Design a protein around this ligand. Structure first.
Ligand SMILES: [Fe+3]
Ligand SMILES: [Fe+3]
Lengths: 36, 36
């Protein structure tokens, strides 16, 4: 994802902010995190 | 992970910071992101 984006896990509610972009998909609780 | 924690994907270099904690394990590029 891109620097500054915020991603949320819909199942457990964990929210992270991207500090350094990478192209990998962020996954949490067996599912792709959702860009906010 | 817990609020304020920083995690890195060693494969693609993506770095995230936890804003709201959740009990799920952060995964990127198919493996567990490493706490810094
Ligand atoms: Fe990755
Ligand atoms: Fe989760």
């Amino acid at each position: 994802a891109n620097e500054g984006d915020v991603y949320k896990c819909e199942l457990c509610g964990q929210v992270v902010k991207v500090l350094e972009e990478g192209g990998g998909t962020l996954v949490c609780c067996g599912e792709d995190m959702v860009k906010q």
